[PDB]
Amino acid sequence: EQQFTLGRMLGKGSVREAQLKDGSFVKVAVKMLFLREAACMKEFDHPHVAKLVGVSPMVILPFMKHGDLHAFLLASRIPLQTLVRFMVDIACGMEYLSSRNFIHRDLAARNCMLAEDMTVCVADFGVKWLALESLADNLYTVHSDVWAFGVTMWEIMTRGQTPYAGIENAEIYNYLIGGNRLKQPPECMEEVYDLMYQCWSADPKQRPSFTCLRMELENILGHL
Ligand SMILES: O=C(NCCCN1CCCC1=O)c1cnc(NCCc2ccncc2)nc1NC1CCCC1
């Protein structure tokens, strides 16, 4: 298939803007690099998960003008209420995906997209976001998805900072095993950091579910 016109580069892994064609012309985004798993991912539908437009190899996703969450956070830096709502949005998307038995593996702010209405959707159906057992055993589960969510929470709170900035990738395992984590940002709400810290328990069963996270973030959102 080639009913779309490859255009300007959006990010570089390569993502490029394109123009998909019954009526007129729709602007999409094409990830340039399978069909069995894309048949499973096509069925997903939720206001906080980025839809699959299709596949062709390359992946066809909706074009989203406000770009990715990570750049947005960075752009602002160079209100807690808005930050907490971003987290709620990601949690809704993730709660949905894990309810469909989908393990994401690559959750990060860069993989979260700002929609037209400035809601955040989880994108990208598929070491600094990886749980200890993802690192030690290549075990990927809902619980390692929650670990990655917790790092994403930290990214939101620090407004786009690189996690473990003073530490090399090769030293991350060693850092974490020693019981060290990402430190509480200055002016970060205790309640926010507590929930985030819970996401990084060495014991994967001691990590909250996405339902639990959504509820406990939604609770915080009501105590504005
Ligand atoms: O770049 C984009 N839009 C314009 C942003 C430019 N902005 C934003 C504020 C100021 C300004 O000038 C963009 C638009 N649509 C898509 N569609 C999702 C596709 C996708 C699929 C799977 N994984 C990951 C992304 N991705 C985009 N970017 C990707 C390439 C790098 C990060 C994500």
Side-chain angles (χ1 to χ4, degrees), residues 1-24 26-224:
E1 287 265 330
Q2 208 180 139
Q3 62 168 167
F4 42 92
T5 313
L6 324 174
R8 208 161 199 159
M9 198 161 199
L10 308 164
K12 190 162 189 173
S14 168
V15 182
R16 238 170 163 201
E17 71 171 53
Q19 297 279 147
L20 183 142
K21 189 169 189 173
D22 291 29
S24 201
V26 200
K27 194 185 196 182
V28 293
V30 176
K31 190 171 199 173
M32 284 138 188
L33 313 152
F34 182 79
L35 211 136
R36 177 274 307 257
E37 227 173 54
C40 310
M41 289 153 185
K42 186 81 188 182
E43 281 227 64
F44 293 149
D45 194 297
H46 190 273
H48 296 298
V49 180
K51 292 169 179 166
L52 183 65
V53 180
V55 279
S56 277
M58 47 214 184
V59 187
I60 322 172
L61 251 89
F63 181 82
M64 286 166 77
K65 190 183 149 192
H66 302 131
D68 65 83
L69 185 51
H70 178 256
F72 180 74
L73 298 166
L74 205 32
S76 103
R77 182 173 140 259
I78 66 181
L80 180 74
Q81 298 189 140
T82 284
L83 298 177
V84 173
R85 191 145 322 186
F86 285 157
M87 292 173 186
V88 167
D89 287 2
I90 296 151
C92 299
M94 284 313 294
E95 174 183 63
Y96 172 80
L97 290 163
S98 60
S99 86
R100 301 211 70 175
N101 307 320
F102 180 86
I103 300 162
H104 186 120
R105 293 193 179 206
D106 202 9
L107 182 65
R110 70 186 164 268
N111 280 332
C112 293
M113 291 299 289
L114 282 166
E116 202 209 325
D117 61 3
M118 297 279 303
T119 58
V120 188
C121 70
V122 170
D124 176 30
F125 299 107
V127 310
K128 286 184 189 217
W129 292 255
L130 302 179
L132 284 159
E133 75 280 357
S134 289
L135 296 168
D137 285 301
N138 246 85
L139 260 182
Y140 293 88
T141 63
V142 60
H143 306 303
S144 59
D145 277 0
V146 163
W147 184 297
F149 178 89
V151 182
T152 305
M153 279 179 75
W154 188 91
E155 286 183 283
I156 283 153
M157 285 309 119
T158 65
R159 284 154 165 117
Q161 294 191 20
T162 301
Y164 322 95
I167 309 158
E168 289 191 34
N169 279 26
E171 291 195 316
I172 292 302
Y173 179 81
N174 276 340
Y175 184 80
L176 292 171
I177 261 301
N180 311 300
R181 295 300 183 255
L182 287 168
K183 296 173 185 185
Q184 180 176 5
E187 291 281 309
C188 178
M189 175 177 278
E190 181 189 17
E191 274 72 27
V192 163
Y193 183 75
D194 272 347
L195 191 56
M196 186 189 297
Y197 197 80
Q198 292 164 230
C199 295
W200 311 317
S201 302
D203 183 356
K205 282 163 278 189
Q206 266 159 231
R207 324 216 255 249
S209 66
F210 283 117
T211 298
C212 185
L213 290 154
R214 190 226 224 243
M215 287 176 74
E216 285 193 300
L217 284 159
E218 271 176 343
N219 185 61
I220 292 167
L221 198 64
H223 290 94
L224 58 158

